Amino acid sequence: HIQKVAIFGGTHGNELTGVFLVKHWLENGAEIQRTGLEVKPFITNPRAVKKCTRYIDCDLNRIFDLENLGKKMSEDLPYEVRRAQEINHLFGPKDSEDSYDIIFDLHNTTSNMGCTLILEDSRNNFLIQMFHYIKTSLAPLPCYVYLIEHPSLKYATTRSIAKYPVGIEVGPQPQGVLRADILDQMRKMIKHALDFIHHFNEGKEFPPCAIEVYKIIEKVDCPRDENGEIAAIIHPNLQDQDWKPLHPGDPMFLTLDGKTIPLGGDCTVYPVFVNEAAYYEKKEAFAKTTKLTLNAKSIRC
Amino acid sequence: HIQKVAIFGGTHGNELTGVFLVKHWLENGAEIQRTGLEVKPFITNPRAVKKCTRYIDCDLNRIFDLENLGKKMSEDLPYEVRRAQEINHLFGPKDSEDSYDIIFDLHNTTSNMGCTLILEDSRNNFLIQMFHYIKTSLAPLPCYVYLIEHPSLKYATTRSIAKYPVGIEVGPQPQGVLRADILDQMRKMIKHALDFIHHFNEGKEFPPCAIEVYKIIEKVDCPRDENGEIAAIIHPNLQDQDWKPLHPGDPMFLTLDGKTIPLGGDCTVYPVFVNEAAYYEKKEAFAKTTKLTLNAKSIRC
Ligand SMILES: CP(=O)(O)N[C@@H](CC(=O)O)C(=O)O
Ligand SMILES: CP(=O)(O)N[C@@H](CC(=O)O)C(=O)O
Numbered sequence: 295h296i297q298k299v300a301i302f303g304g305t306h307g308n309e310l311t312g313v314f315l316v317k318h319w320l321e322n323g324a325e326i327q328r329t330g331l332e333v334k335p336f337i338t339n340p341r342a343v344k345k346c347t348r349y350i351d352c353d354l355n356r357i358f359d360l361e362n363l364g365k366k367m368s369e370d371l372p373y374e375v376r377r378a379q380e381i382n383h384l385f386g387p388k389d390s391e392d393s394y395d396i397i398f399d400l401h402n403t404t405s406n407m408g409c410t411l412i413l414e415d416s417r418n419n420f421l422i423q424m425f426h427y428i429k430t431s432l433a434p435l436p437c438y439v440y441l442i443e444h445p446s447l448k449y450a451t452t453r454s455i456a457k458y459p460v461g462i463e464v465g466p467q468p469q470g471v472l473r474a475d476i477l478d479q480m481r482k483m484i485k486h487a488l489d490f491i492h493h494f495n496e497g498k499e500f501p502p503c504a505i506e507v508y509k510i511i512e513k514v515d516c517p518r519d520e521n522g523e524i525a526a527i528i529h530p531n532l533q534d535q536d537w538k539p540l541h542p543g544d545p546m547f548l549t550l551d552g553k554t555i556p557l558g559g560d561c562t563v564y565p566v567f568v569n570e571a572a573y574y575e576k577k578e579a580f581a582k583t584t585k586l587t588l589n590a591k592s593i594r595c
Numbered sequence: 596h597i598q599k600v601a602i603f604g605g606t607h608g609n610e611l612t613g614v615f616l617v618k619h620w621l622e623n624g625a626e627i628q629r630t631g632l633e634v635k636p637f638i639t640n641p642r643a644v645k646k647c648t649r650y651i652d653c654d655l656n657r658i659f660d661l662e663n664l665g666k667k668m669s670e671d672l673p674y675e676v677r678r679a680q681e682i683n684h685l686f687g688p689k690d691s692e693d694s695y696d697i698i699f700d701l702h703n704t705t706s707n708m709g710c711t712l713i714l715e716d717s718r719n720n721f722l723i724q725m726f727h728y729i730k731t732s733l734a735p736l737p738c739y740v741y742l743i744e745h746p747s748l749k750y751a752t753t754r755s756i757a758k759y760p761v762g763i764e765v766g767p768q769p770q771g772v773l774r775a776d777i778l779d780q781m782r783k784m785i786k787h788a789l790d791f792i793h794h795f796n797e798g799k800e801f802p803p804c805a806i807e808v809y810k811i812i813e814k815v816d817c818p819r820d821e822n823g824e825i826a827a828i829i830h831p832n833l834q835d836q837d838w839k840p841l842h843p844g845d846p847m848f849l850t851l852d853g854k855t856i857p858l859g860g861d862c863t864v865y866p867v868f869v870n871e872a873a874y875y876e877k878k879e880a881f882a883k884t885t886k887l888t889l890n891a892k893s894i895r896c
């Protein structure tokens with residue numbers, strides 16, 4: 295019932311856990327094969343990987359949409375646009391029924407997020423169930439679900455080609471660096487994800503379940519100069535405390551002088567992607583989330 | 596007696612602690628001024644800083660030597676070569692008596708080295724004394740001295756222009772990221788360094804002293820493919836254990852299949868710059884050092 299599965303690595307070329315795993319699995323997929331399940335590992339941005347850079351012309355993971363995927367194939371096209379098409383053709387088309395069933399996009403963050411799963415749809419019982427299985431399997435190792443469903447802030451990811459897109463994000467890891475513990479953590483996330491798909495194709499019935507997710511609400515920039523240069527930094531107490539609750543009282547930023555700037559607003563939030571290297575460019579110091587619980591109905595077949 | 600002092604930041608454009616401190620100090624040097632001491636903060640690689648990249652055409656901190664500094668000023672010269680000259684003219688010439696007395700070059704590492712001082716000369720009583728002062732001042736906060744003196748492996752640093760070159764290195768920090776705790780640690784290293792120069796120019800007498808240093812002996816690459824691609828990774832037990840002793844028995848690398856590769860050789864070593872992002876390009880997984888004690892004679896002004 296689920297037949298076509300891919301694992302993407304190297305969507306960003308300087309996030310090496312995915313690149314390294316995939317390169318190995320292309321030479322020996324044993325670890326990712328399951329009986330009755332054919333899984334294809336793939337390097338999405340081979341050129342950014344070669345320059346150990348994040349992208350060449352633009353962020354690949356933001357352009358899998360109509361505006362871009364419908365463009366006439368040319369050679370004056372940004373590399374990543376030319377490439378998003380090549381990928382849509384191989385694992386899609388997006389929104390077609392010939393699309394791959396499931397795509398896992400592998401990712402790293404400099405933030406201290408631990409094992410993270412990214413959910414694009416708050417009503418996909420199938421994914422919710424997958425995520426619950428992985429969570430439960432990993433325990434007591436924590437695992438967190440970032441829900442990026444938003445009327446305007448949902449971006450068009452590489453993995454959104456599939457009917458079931460899955461983001462796998464593990465941190466903290468500096469860009470351009472290959473840590474062993476981070477690699478082990480990612481592997482295990484995948485083992486349990488594939489294990490769940492097998493169990494499902496073997497007709498196992500899953501009761502209802504609830505999981506905690508963190509829902510995007512707003513992205514915060516750091517204080518800036520009169521000239522638009524960085525004017526404070528992530529307060530020591532906020533640094534590395536991804537996922538933990540931050541109340542309106544508490545410290546957010548720190549100047550050199552160094553006055554503390556506190557949260558404000560009227561409600562507790564849960565920060566994610568705190569001090570992510572790649573978001574300095576995007577003017578995002580961190581993202582605010584509300585914690586909530588989602589339910590899945592049972593599923594089978 | 597010491598008059599001309601500089602602080603370099605942004606030698607590598609993606610190491611932001613230095614860039615940030617310097618940019619601020621150019622607008623208000625109060626923190627780095629001392630009575631009778633005029634100290635100049637400077638951005639060494641302004642262009643790499645703008646691209647938040649490490650270098651543009653080549654590593655700036657390896658070319659302050661005759662081969663490069665004697666090249667005819669042209670415009671077909673790598674940016675960094677063109678720039679090393681501009682810098683030699685402003686704070687040197689290297690090997691002249693008009694050179695600045697002291698240059699501090701600020702740096703960041705993805706390795707877990709904490710506060711680090713880099714010594715280019717094992718006989719410079721003046722530096723040894725400085726370093727001893729900083730070490731003892733910082734305590735119990737650790738501080739380590741990396742001695743790069745070698746017949747062939749001493750590289751020609753930006754700071755080597757001065758009579759007294761000083762490398763200030765603080766980790767771990769991902770590239771392109773501004774951590775607050777790392778910034779505090781660097782500031783304090785500088786406060787105590789300037790404090791020591793003041794004390795010296797005020798005629799304070801310093802008795803003899805001993806300090807421990809870690810001396811470069813050999814740089815190690817990671818195991819490679821038949822095609823020269825990375826084949827193992829820093830073993831979990833070696834990761835993050837910069838400075839601590841590694842015996843010939845102990846694990847060094849780890850393959851994807853779980854196979855451990857151990858140290859070998861015949862003597863204990865002390866690894867430094869373990870899993871430094873910037874040394875993937877240079878084929879250096881980490882550097883082996885022998886621990887040594889150095890002595891300074893007393894000094895006065
Ligand atoms: C810090 P990252 O590059 O792993 N973040 C992705 C988020 C994702 O994978 O959905 C992005 O910027 O598009
Ligand atoms: C990790 P880094 O690039 O700050 N290390 C310096 C070391 C130094 O300052 O001597 C270098 O590669 O030249």
Ligand SMILES: [Zn+2]
Binds near residue numbers: 309401
């Ligand atoms: Zn990413």
Ligand SMILES: [Zn+2]
Binds near residue numbers: 606607610702
């Ligand atoms: Zn550096």
